Design a protein around this ligand. Structure first.
Ligand SMILES: [Mg+2]
Ligand SMILES: [Mg+2]
Ligand SMILES: [Mg+2]
Ligand SMILES: [Mg+2]
Ligand SMILES: [Mg+2]
Ligand SMILES: [Mg+2]
Ligand SMILES: [Mg+2]
Ligand SMILES: [Mg+2]
Ligand SMILES: [Mg+2]
Ligand SMILES: [Mg+2]
Ligand SMILES: [Mg+2]
Ligand SMILES: [Mg+2]
Ligand SMILES: [Mg+2]
Ligand SMILES: [Mg+2]
Ligand SMILES: [Mg+2]
Ligand SMILES: [Mg+2]
Ligand SMILES: [Mg+2]
Ligand SMILES: [Mg+2]
Ligand SMILES: [Mg+2]
Ligand SMILES: [Mg+2]
Ligand SMILES: [Mg+2]
Ligand SMILES: [Mg+2]
Ligand SMILES: [Mg+2]
Ligand SMILES: [Mg+2]
Ligand SMILES: [Mg+2]
Ligand SMILES: [Mg+2]
Ligand SMILES: [Mg+2]
Ligand SMILES: [Mg+2]
Ligand SMILES: [Mg+2]
Ligand SMILES: [Mg+2]
Ligand SMILES: [Mg+2]
Ligand SMILES: [Mg+2]
Ligand SMILES: [Mg+2]
Ligand SMILES: [Mg+2]
Ligand SMILES: [Mg+2]
Ligand SMILES: [Mg+2]
Ligand SMILES: [Mg+2]
Ligand SMILES: [Mg+2]
Ligand SMILES: [Mg+2]
Ligand SMILES: [Mg+2]
Ligand SMILES: [Mg+2]
Ligand SMILES: [Mg+2]
Ligand SMILES: [Mg+2]
Ligand SMILES: [Mg+2]
Ligand SMILES: [Mg+2]
Ligand SMILES: [Mg+2]
Ligand SMILES: [Mg+2]
Ligand SMILES: [Mg+2]
Ligand SMILES: [Mg+2]
Ligand SMILES: [Mg+2]
Ligand SMILES: [Mg+2]
Ligand SMILES: [Mg+2]
Ligand SMILES: [Mg+2]
Ligand SMILES: [Mg+2]
Ligand SMILES: [Mg+2]
Ligand SMILES: [Mg+2]
Ligand SMILES: [Mg+2]
Ligand SMILES: [Mg+2]
Ligand SMILES: [Mg+2]
Ligand SMILES: [Mg+2]
Ligand SMILES: [Mg+2]
Ligand SMILES: [Mg+2]
Ligand SMILES: [Mg+2]
Ligand SMILES: [Mg+2]
Ligand SMILES: [Mg+2]
Ligand SMILES: [Mg+2]
Ligand SMILES: [Mg+2]
Ligand SMILES: [Mg+2]
Ligand SMILES: [Mg+2]
Ligand SMILES: [Mg+2]
Ligand SMILES: [Mg+2]
Ligand SMILES: [Mg+2]
Ligand SMILES: [Mg+2]
Ligand SMILES: [Mg+2]
Ligand SMILES: [Mg+2]
Ligand SMILES: [Mg+2]
Ligand SMILES: [Mg+2]
Ligand SMILES: [Mg+2]
Ligand SMILES: [Mg+2]
Lengths: 259, 158, 134
RNA sequence: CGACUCUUAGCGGUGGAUCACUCGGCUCGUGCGUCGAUGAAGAACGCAGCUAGCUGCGAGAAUUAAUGUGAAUUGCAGGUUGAUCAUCGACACUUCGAACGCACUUGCGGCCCCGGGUUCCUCCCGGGGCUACGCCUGUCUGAGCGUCGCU
RNA sequence: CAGCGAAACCACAGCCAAGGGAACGGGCUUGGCGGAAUCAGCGGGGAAAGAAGACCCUGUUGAGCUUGACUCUAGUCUGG
RNA sequence: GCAGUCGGCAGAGCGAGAAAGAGAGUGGCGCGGACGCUACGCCGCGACGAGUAGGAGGGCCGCUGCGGUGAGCCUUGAAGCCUAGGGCGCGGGCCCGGGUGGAGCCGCCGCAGGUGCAGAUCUUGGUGGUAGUAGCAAAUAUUCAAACGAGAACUUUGAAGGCCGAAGUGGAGAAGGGUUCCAUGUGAACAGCAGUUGAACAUGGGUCAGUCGGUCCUGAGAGAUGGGCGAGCGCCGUUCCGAAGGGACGGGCG
RNA sequence: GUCGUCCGACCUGGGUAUAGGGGCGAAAGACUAAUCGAACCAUCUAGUAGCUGGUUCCCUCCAAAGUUUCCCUCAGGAUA
RNA sequence: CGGCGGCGAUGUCGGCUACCCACCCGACCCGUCUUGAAACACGGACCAAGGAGUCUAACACGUGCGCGAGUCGGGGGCUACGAAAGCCGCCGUGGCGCAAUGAAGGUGAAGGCCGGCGGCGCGCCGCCGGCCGAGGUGGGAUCCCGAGGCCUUCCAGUCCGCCGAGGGCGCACCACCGGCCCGUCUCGCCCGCCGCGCCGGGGAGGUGGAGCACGAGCGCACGUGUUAGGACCCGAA
RNA sequence: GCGGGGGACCGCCCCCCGGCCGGCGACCGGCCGCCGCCGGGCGCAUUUCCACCGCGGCGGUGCGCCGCGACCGGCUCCGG
RNA sequence: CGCGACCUCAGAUCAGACGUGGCGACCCGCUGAAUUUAAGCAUAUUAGUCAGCGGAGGAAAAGAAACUAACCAGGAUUCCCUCAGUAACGGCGAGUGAACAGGGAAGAGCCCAGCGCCGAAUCCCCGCCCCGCGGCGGGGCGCGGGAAAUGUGGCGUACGGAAGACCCACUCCCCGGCGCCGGGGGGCCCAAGUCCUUCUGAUCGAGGCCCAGCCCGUGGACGGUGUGAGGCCGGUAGCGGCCCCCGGCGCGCCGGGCCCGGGUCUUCCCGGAGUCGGGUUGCUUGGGAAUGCAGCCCAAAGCGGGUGGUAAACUCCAUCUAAGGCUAAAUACCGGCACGAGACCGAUAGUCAACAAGUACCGUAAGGGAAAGUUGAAAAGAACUUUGAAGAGAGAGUUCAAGAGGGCGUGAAACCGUUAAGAGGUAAACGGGUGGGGUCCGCGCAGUCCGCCCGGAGGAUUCAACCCGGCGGCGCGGUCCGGCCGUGCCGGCGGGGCGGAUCUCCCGCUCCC
């Protein structure tokens, strides 16, 4: 808000006496705005309580190791079919989930080649779900330049741009990303992992140099290696019913002793 | 009033600091404008290097930094004199000149002299009238293989 | 998607610019599509409407295959008046009801020399696009 | 039973809440970064066929010219060789205001020229051009028992 | 009576005796008891209305005035 | 306590007062078997439950907006609002039915806050009781007939009776007001009853100067230039540290 | 209504002069635009307040202090 | 219960609740300050809408995440949403951390065994070599060994699993004792050389320190608390 | 002599191989075997599968509303 | 006496110019509080802040050391990060509080006076001619007038400068005009559904568009159009088009200017004064025996002066060269012109102002300062009849709807009118517990199915078992065949990248004959 808002009056309290409630009031004049409650959050007119300043800390810096960590985790989750279907991408007919199409499609120019590529890669049902999710937003966002909301289709991730961005950018829901500039805001939308990704081939091969293996560090980063698993076998059921633990377990007490 | 065990603090907020608060919401705008001014300068001085003239090797004073060398303001007049370069043609062929700087030792003098003689060895000088080459100007092969250099001209290393 | 940083997409700015547009910009807003035969004749999809175009109403209560000439282009309420597109008041006098030209199909233009110049310009720019695409 | 009173529901008033809209703000950022004695900023008074306000304009007064545009304006009348709009580079721009002949009353001048008047000889009337302070360079007229020289 | 037509005030309200109670109740306890809607009067009560007690005290709250209060200062006297 | 749902790859045990193995080897027909287990879940025992100031936890309590999501809802009717309808929850609150309304809205995971009201002699707006009550009582006074009009205590005319009583309730000006002046029309609003009336509202009109005033003079004073002061806008000063006369008759010369 | 004065330190219009720690006062701290023991307007200023008033959803669990010592401390803090 | 009964279609069944009414018992009007309020304490006629612990900075502690003796690009630079995100390492300058202590000059964080030699009178009081080497005591979660033993005719007899008297190594941590570093004090003998000096270094014993004694920090986010800011909101003279 | 280029070494990584070993339950193919399912045949009605009926039995769940009884068990208050 | 120089000073409506005033967000120079905090208050703090005054510009100011430092030294100014809440100041209390070094952004330097030499070689103005003529400029002619020797111009400025002699070495910079060749404003334009049904008051809704899975899509931003639109329209996208205009950028011609240097040696020369500095006073600063500024008094020097953060004397050393001047960029910008955007606000909010808002109105004045959005898709804004003097009705009519009727969307609550029902002497109201009556609800009113078996008739080309084919699951099928992978390892007549504070043939460069 403006820092002059509500303070652009001359207003004194009438003091005690006068059988009125001791708030500042407007001076003089024959008009409605005369003795009419000027300063304070409780008055009509007057500034709000604790007026919002511009120098609120709008921006948050995240550690670089954590930002690469989140990119690593979102990429890792975008290759498991349960997590992307739980994100709601329609992938029940795609032929492999780390869906890498070969490098010819980066040289696309027209949108019809892009649509035919998605239809033959069976990812067009996601764009059809995005079309079905096109609607108007509830609330004042419509009056604040945010009239239409719609869900997210795939993220086409590429290495070099030979027109693929212009060939794909008119299809709704599709986000284009360069592998050198992977965005966590566009690879885990809403903070939820499981974004559907369609890779191109050189884009897919540069991932082992952008983030590294465990044996080799990142060739395209200064000092970064892949984060380390706090547990390596996460199959808890396979761990528990393996014979080594079961020979050391005691007998289970499965019997209900009620009152 | 103070509570239990804690620091004694002296915040310097007893003035009317909120008039003179300088937010940085124009930070990427300043960065993007400085970048476009840099590329406009680099495009204007088209074969001359973008960062600027060559800067000499200076030892930092004041014992915390006196093991480290860095780029000074300009080559000093005795360095240009030993290198055999006129102190007015130096700034025309791209050499920074510091009249104010003394020398106190031979080795920094000689290192910046050898820097000047290493820079004039790399200098490709275009002729002043484009259809008529002159006596000291560079030849048409290095004119056709001239490029604009990025970063500091022969950057200073420890 | 718009990429031009000088063209606004702000809803209130677009609405202010539409409802406070001066009359020669209003003429371009009050533009009607040509018929299918007029499209295949002049290679022009849309044209600003004038005081003598024979048109058809295709949306509204007065829609149908009947044809009437525009009798008035009332640019201030963004409407046009067509011949038999009318309604009767209480007292028995007919008044013309306003029709927006976007709901209007032009079947016969008033061909002036200005109109022919505009038609040639639109057809030529369309063909420049068609022969630039290949 | 009734009248009156109380409670609840239905309907109707009073009132303008809520909700949904939004040619308006607020905040941030970009580019440019321009007033005036050639009279600014501001103010006053006028100007439309019907016009009070707002807006636009200046006795050429809701505008003139030129260009772009290309058939309207419209609340009602009336009347394409370019209507209306936009641009605006041509022209015009009342009175005051630093405000400038002197004053602040719409008061009083003075000088020059032109037209009536006259019969330029003055008057009188109308019109035009000048008449403020400070200050710079230069010009002319001068001032001085200032300093000299010459006769 | 015809026409016109306000305001102050208002937790809810409004019959008493004693009791206890924040030591003087319209409400609570125990009694006396209690009957629509009203008019003109009336000044016992509502510890009635009016105005964040002006008396008194506290505040590390002031202001007007005085001087032998503390610290300064215009002016003035005096020396350089 | 429960990963032991350990099934023709079966054998369905582990509450039982007493440290530990329902251990393994080798010599002497019919194709069957509830549920469970959002492990942040589910189940079982036992004890307990006051609460101001205050602290903590859980909210499938609520509002607004953002990021994801619901192949969500919606002109075959959204939000909002009303309801003697049906219900749910300990509760915050929510869901559904009916009606009205006429265009948007909500569930879930996270994010953000200008996020929940009974009070503050709170702010702004609206409405009550009081109450058809107080009141329309200072300056002696009105009555009769007629007219116009839908309509008369009040307008107009006539008659009568009265008052101001020339220091006026008269005839005129100053200042101030600014069209209130005049004529016609209207009776919506105002003129604290009314009104056919008005200083109201709407249409048109109206102010004529050599001699009447301003204009001119100076008064008490105000106030520039000069001068002086002043960081400075400027201030003092008004004859004072001023070369302050631009005027005139006569003579000569063009 | 009754009254003081009503040829003189009389009453009065217009013009003019004095402006806020200043004016003006036949002197009451009177008057200075319903304001005067320091006018009015705007700003500094959302001045400060150990002092009054208020402080907005539910359920669950735990649950006080008015005492010690020091303080221009006694309507407040620090400390236990 | 492997016991039964009665009533039913236009006048009846059920509906704890929900509207009105009746009755018995209970029951003073809320908010607030207060030892004590229903108070003859103050605010509140009624209704709708608005209306009060916020933001920034610093610090503390707790918690979550990342990396970790390091950590951090925040400032700069390179390449619609995007003013975002990605990158830079010869952009870690720098911050905080890894070292303290003293006013400062300044100094700055284990030592023992062996071979050789009453100089003195380090048997004591230095340097040549080699070796071993970062303390101890008590408690201490966990863990290790195991005298024996956990039956199915009975003697063996092996392997595995389990239990176990007793004995161990002892995490973190606590308490105590030693040890080391800087300041300061007391006592006392030596060792060094480019300059042998108003030089420099050492020891024993106390004692002051926000230290060491085989790290734990940095960045980010959340929560509370204390402040400086209008600072929860309204209020002076 | 300086600075730079060259070479060697060392470490790590990547790729060819030669060999063990592990996994294919975050990651397979081929045939063989066993099973299960789907489809198509043959099979042809003392089998199978549909739908109806009895106030049928068995086991579970409830009776539309209003009721009553019986015994079992727990806690109680009494009595002979 | 008179005439003429010069100096000083006047006058003019003399000829030509210039200043005033405004705006003021940012900037510069002065002036300059108190509230506040210190739990009082006086120094301090607030704060060199507000208010006041003057002056600007598109930036200002600052700025090329009378500097920092004590180092192996750096090198104008400005700005950012860090220095650093530190040195230091402080009733040493409250509190205040820099600088250097370092990394960056930017980056640019220069000119006088003085000292000297060149026949004042210099400048301004009027007259004529030619050109260009809307930034009044270029060439030539004037026995044209002034300024200036009380010092203009050329060279030259502390980094040194100049002159002479000896060597080395090129003839190309710029001005005024002019024509010719290859970013900015404005204007006009450029894809594809109104296809077939269907909802509706209206569709932009819903369904469909085959074998091209309607069409375009470098366009699926947005707005308008009778709900909701990629395809109806304007637009959007595009190194898309066209036409003007204004530049910038190259080459060419005419006239004019400038007829210029580096090195070596020799000889000369060189600096800003009522200023520095001292004392004192007052303000200011972190600057503390005095950081800066100012008044007053004293008052300089030249192997000198200033600084070297403790006053002073002696002595070394270091570093600059004061008292004259200009200078872009990085930097700042709540005013203005034109834009764009938003996790903002949504008519008691957001600016005071969404609207005839700094308006109406108030105050003598300085000043103070509102309320107020919404019919509908379209006025289609209710013709006509009838009552009344009329307002106001009743009919009729428009509309999807007047249950939207010109302060009209939705239309809450308080409060009021009426209808319905119930009740009524301890004011009402409430909690618990029932009862009665209503309103509706259960679309209650002969009441439950589910699984297995028995019986009864019925229907069905039907079960098991065998054949073919496909799919899937599962002993390494001990040691079936082959692949792939390893936060697995070993081997090497292996072929490479990266790194290392691990060691050691060529080139450049620096002394040496
Ligand atoms: Mg406001
Ligand atoms: Mg809403
Ligand atoms: Mg506390
Ligand atoms: Mg640069
Ligand atoms: Mg409303
Ligand atoms: Mg014209
Ligand atoms: Mg025209
Ligand atoms: Mg006068
Ligand atoms: Mg009456
Ligand atoms: Mg009472
Ligand atoms: Mg009672
Ligand atoms: Mg009484
Ligand atoms: Mg009081
Ligand atoms: Mg009082
Ligand atoms: Mg006290
Ligand atoms: Mg006082
Ligand atoms: Mg409890
Ligand atoms: Mg609508
Ligand atoms: Mg908000
Ligand atoms: Mg309320
Ligand atoms: Mg009465
Ligand atoms: Mg009346
Ligand atoms: Mg009259
Ligand atoms: Mg006459
Ligand atoms: Mg004066
Ligand atoms: Mg008097
Ligand atoms: Mg007195
Ligand atoms: Mg107190
Ligand atoms: Mg108290
Ligand atoms: Mg009772
Ligand atoms: Mg209280
Ligand atoms: Mg008391
Ligand atoms: Mg109470
Ligand atoms: Mg009492
Ligand atoms: Mg009180
Ligand atoms: Mg009250
Ligand atoms: Mg509310
Ligand atoms: Mg922490
Ligand atoms: Mg943006
Ligand atoms: Mg704390
Ligand atoms: Mg406050
Ligand atoms: Mg606070
Ligand atoms: Mg206040
Ligand atoms: Mg003149
Ligand atoms: Mg104080
Ligand atoms: Mg205080
Ligand atoms: Mg005080
Ligand atoms: Mg100060
Ligand atoms: Mg100021
Ligand atoms: Mg000025
Ligand atoms: Mg300017
Ligand atoms: Mg300067
Ligand atoms: Mg510097
Ligand atoms: Mg620090
Ligand atoms: Mg200060
Ligand atoms: Mg520095
Ligand atoms: Mg000279
Ligand atoms: Mg010169
Ligand atoms: Mg210099
Ligand atoms: Mg469709
Ligand atoms: Mg659309
Ligand atoms: Mg639309
Ligand atoms: Mg479509
Ligand atoms: Mg189109
Ligand atoms: Mg288009
Ligand atoms: Mg375009
Ligand atoms: Mg000070
Ligand atoms: Mg010294
Ligand atoms: Mg010293
Ligand atoms: Mg100088
Ligand atoms: Mg200088
Ligand atoms: Mg409003
Ligand atoms: Mg509203
Ligand atoms: Mg408003
Ligand atoms: Mg409304
Ligand atoms: Mg409706
Ligand atoms: Mg409606
Ligand atoms: Mg309505
Ligand atoms: Mg009744």
């Amino acid at each position: 808000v403006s820092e002059l808002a509500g303070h652009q009056t001359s207003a004194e309290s009438w003091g005690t006496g006068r059988a009125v409630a001791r708030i500042p009031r407007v001076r003089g004049g024959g008009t409605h705005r005369s003795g009419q409650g000027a300063f304070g959050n409780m008055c009509r007119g007057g500034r709000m309580f604790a007026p919002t300043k511009t120098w609120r800390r709008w921006h948050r810096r995240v550690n670089t190791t954590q930002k690469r960590y989140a990119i690593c985790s979102a990429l890792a989750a975008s290759a498991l079919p349960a997590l992307v279907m739980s994100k709601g991408h329609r992938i029940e007919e795609v032929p492999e989930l780390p869906l890498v199409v070969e490098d010819k499609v980066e040289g696309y120019k027209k949108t019809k080649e892009a649509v035919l590529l998605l239809k033959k890669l069976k990812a067009w049902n996601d764009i059809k779900k995005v079309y079905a999710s096109q609607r108007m937003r509830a609330g004042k966002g419509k009056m604040r330049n945010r009239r239409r909301i719609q869900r997210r289709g795939p993220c086409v991730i590429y290495n070099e741009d030979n027109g693929i961005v212009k060939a794909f950018r008119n299809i709704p829901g599709i986000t284009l990303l360069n592998v050198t500039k992977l965005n966590i805001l566009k690879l885990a939308p809403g903070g939820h992992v499981g974004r559907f990704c369609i890779w191109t081939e050189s884009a897919f091969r540069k991932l082992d140099d952008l983030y590294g293996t465990w044996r080799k560090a990142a060739s395209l980063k200064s000092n970064y290696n892949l984060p380390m698993h706090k547990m390596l076998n996460t199959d808890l059921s396979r761990i528990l019913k393996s014979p080594e633990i079961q020979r050391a377990l005691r007998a289970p007490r499965k019997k209900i002793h009620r009152r | 009033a103070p509570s239990r065990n804690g620091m004694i603090l002296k915040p310097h907020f007893h003035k009317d600091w909120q008039r003179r608060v300088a937010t940085w919401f124009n930070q990427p705008a300043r960065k993007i404008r400085r970048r476009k001014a840099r590329q406009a300068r680099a495009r204007r001085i088209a074969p001359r290097p973008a960062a600027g003239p060559i800067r000499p090797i200076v030892r930092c004073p004041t014992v915390r930094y006196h093991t480290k060398v860095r780029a000074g303001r300009g080559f000093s007049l005795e360095e240009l004199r030993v290198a055999g370069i006129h102190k007015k043609v130096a700034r025309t062929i791209g050499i920074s000149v510091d009249p104010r700087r003394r020398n106190k030792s031979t080795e920094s003098l000689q290192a910046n002299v050898q820097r000047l003689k290493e820079y004039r060895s790399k200098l490709v000088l275009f002729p002043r009238k484009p259809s008529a080459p002159k006596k000291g100007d560079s030849s048409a092969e290095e004119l056709k293989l001239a490029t604009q250099l990025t970063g500091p001209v022969m950057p200073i290393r420890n | 998607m718009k990429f031009n940083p000088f063209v606004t997409s702000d809803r209130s700015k677009n609405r202010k610019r539409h409802f406070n547009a001066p009359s020669h910009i209003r003429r371009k807003i009050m533009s009607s599509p040509l018929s299918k035969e007029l499209r295949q004749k002049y290679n022009v999809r849309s044209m600003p409407i004038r005081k003598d175009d024979e048109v058809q109403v295709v949306r509204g209560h007065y829609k149908g295959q009947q044809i009437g000439k525009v009798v008035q282009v009332y640019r201030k309420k963004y409407v046009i008046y067509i011949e038999r597109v009318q309604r009767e008041k209480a007292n028995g006098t007919t008044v013309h009801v306003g029709i927006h030209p976007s709901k209007v199909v032009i079947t016969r233009l008033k061909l002036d020399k200005d109109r022919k110049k505009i038609l040639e310009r639109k057809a030529k720019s369309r063909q420049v696009g068609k022969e630039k695409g290949k």
